[PDB]
């Protein structure tokens, strides 16, 4: 196919960057006009309040919806100067401020949206040139339900190009940076949400997750998030670059400063509004008594998946939370899901690249390839025979690289059926394993601390803690527990990895210079048991960081 | 290479013979020891009253079990629907949980519902002599709810048919007319329940397998949303096909029995034993509701011309629904030919049926399957060649034959996304008209034996709602009058191809056969679908309530 150059892509970028500048300029001029009429307002007293108190003050009338909106809008503008997390300001959000239903459970709460969520008259670019100049006709289902619950969506946050990366850079809107350290990644693909919420710019945000896209940004930026069962929320109206892929399940969920906020958001979304607008979502209301329950829990755990070697901080975080849960009265049981290498190398990789990434590569024609994507584009473009040959060559010395590369080959519809059946069986397998040890819930090390910029796309193996539960389709949440100590960073010199392939070499360098950065833990429950998962997350939060309760 | 098949067929016939002999000796023992017991009053009792007398202790579980077992054995003589007698039942009978909602209730299972120590042959050789080492999930919950599964019921070969014959156990017959097919693939269940051999049964449905036998034999059936109930442990031909949703559901004499069955399944035990199933309890408030309904309806899908019996059945219920204060609204799903020919056909045969064909290595092809097997065996270049050669003459056959060609994984995604968009487009219409529920004709009456496999276009009324993945249920509303049967001489179809020809002959000579109607609701609204079925039953056959 004839080369079309980069001209159309270059023009798109400048247009996108302008829409970015104009958004920020409108925000600034809107908040300066508010402060010229309300100098009395205390910003810091407002901005430090937890979402639960904030929302109940909006209800009591002690705080006006205009006050909370323009303070957070101002905070958002300020944190954006150092992080670059906002791509667009939602123009007609001020008309929503006045229309907001007073009885709505999220009344007057400013909510941030990952760019993939479509908003009327706005681009969902995904960092992809061919998607710019393409305003959405409608608000997507979840946006509509947020609005109906009194919430105020106000910003689109940055993604990495295409969203198939856990970094946060794209040739259109640039690179998002971690609010704790300029050199570090905020995570991805919901990275903008991580940088914004993490630095106090938003009390609540929404992201998507297919391989760790909610949990990576949450852990890297020291906030918490929840990836629920795939079809617990409406996926309707969401921009993606590949459609009709059901093997590995894509899901969306809340990201917030504390877990109590997450359970509020989940309760707000799970209502008649959602179930009517998207009838394909099972009408499962938020089970309150399960979330509030204070019974002792049988908690499974592991210190390592025996695939990606945890950092000393990850290991330390896991053991510390494991020990404090035993002291709390919970029974802790060693548990490790069988055949993890299988789940990732053939089930996950194969489920995401069944077509050999052909449909995926369509979005990159005549476009730039952002450096934060690594060689993923270069590798996927190679012919099937070359992917096979290279895989066989690599198999003796580099086993991980071999199996991943082989699964990125196109197969028939027949072999897709086989694959989807094998995922169903593996799901049944881990559930059986789960029940035999009679677990309530599961505790997992969460990848951390934040990796250096432009490294995540070169260390794919690190998704082995997150993508496992998109494949299994289990509700999985992430909660911050500790920060990197000086002792933790020194031990990184004595980090070898389990395989010693080029992924481990890059990951060893990426986690250095990380003192004072946050490290999180992962909480996992059985499918449809997100209220159980939140209850467990609430416990973990209470024992590790009790300031948030 | 037919030695294996002849052996498998011989062995299966011995097991079926011994199954029936065990049954006979068991019922003769109980009848002689309990001669005082009134069997006739027992069998005509509606299931709701039957469990009520069982929970109160007015009737014993031993009483209801062997009374039904005797009837099952007797009706089997004219239908050939029982494939196997599940011997564990007699010990499980004594060990039934007293608190269970289905305590002492005998349940009949389709052969694909795997039961410990028994085969799920599906009419294939390669599955004979391979007993299940485990009860499937739904079978477990039934037992945990006090139910007693007693028999395995016959299916057409490979289960991809709405007839009911296989080389192992032979042909199943409609309990109303010997020359008629009982429908399929839950054909055994249709015949058994249809003549009072069982109060309750379980079937599967990929394209009408619950709704065809229920309509043909004159009983109630429900096809829920694919994943409302646990599919774990079910035997099938091809695994991993998710585009067109496979569903399982109850089959019984009245809709009240279906609701009681669904309430029993939608419990703690099902959700614990299969956590992949969304824990949606049975919403009593919805099923029991009596608010007027905005009812969508159509008399024809403009793809398969309904029989005069069908058309009358549709309008009559529509009329009584209007008379009962329900507002009736003309409604038709968009692009039905597109949904059948490219989506539904392509969904089931994305791989050209290669995986389906593997089960037929060295096996007999039952006449009831028609030309399906040799048509699939054709190479894709030749499937394509015939496709656009037949295109000018018979578009239906041409568009089906093309959709039975192998695709790449890339092409499946494209097709899966088209199914997701179509599902959203039909919902968009549904909301635009503000519908509660949808009324649909149900292909009937029963077709003659060996013609369902030669009239593939007749799946139109059923398969569409597997493609949409909507809860759909049938309720018998009328019977074929000689007047209706006479008008079948004027039936032409919309295309006049062989599918229209075979169907014209097959539906003839049907006086006295049951005609049903179809109730459709939105995904996960099974209890609303049952509420509608309850209404349709009450207005058309008030004696059932």
Description:
Chain B: The modification Phosphoserine is found at residue 209. Chain B: It is an enzyme of class 3 (hydrolase). The structure is a homodimer. The first copy, chain A, has 549 residues and is an alpha/beta fold. Chain A has a single domain (1-549), classed as Amidase signature (AS) domain (Amidase signature (AS) enzymes), CATH 3.90.1300. Helices cover 42% and strands 11% of the residues of chain A. Chain A contains 22 helices and 13 strands. Chain A has helices at residues 7-35, 43-47, 51-60, 65-83, 94-99, 141-148, 191-198, 215-220, 259-269, 272-277, 288-292, 312-328, 340-352, 358-361, 376-381, 384-394, 399-407, 413-436, 468-471, 486-490, 502-510, 530-544; strands at residues 86-89, 110-114, 152-157, 169-170, 174-175, 204-209, 224-227, 251-256, 298-301, 331-334, 441-445, 476-483, 518-524. The radius of gyration of chain A is 22 Å and the shape is globular. Chain A starts with 6 loop residues before the first helix and ends in a 5-residue tail after the last helix.
Briefly say what this structure is.
Chain A is an alpha/beta fold and about 550 residues long. Chain A is built from 22 helices and 13 strands. The first copy, chain A, has helices spanning about 5-35, 45, 50-60, 65-85, 95-100, 140-150, 190-200, 215-220, 260-270, 270-275, 290, 310-330, 340-350, 360, 375-380, 385-395, 400-405, 415-435, 470, 485-490, 500-510, 530-545, and strands at about 85-90, 110-115, 150-155, 170, 175, 205-210, 225, 250-255, 300, 330-335, 440-445, 475-485, 520-525.
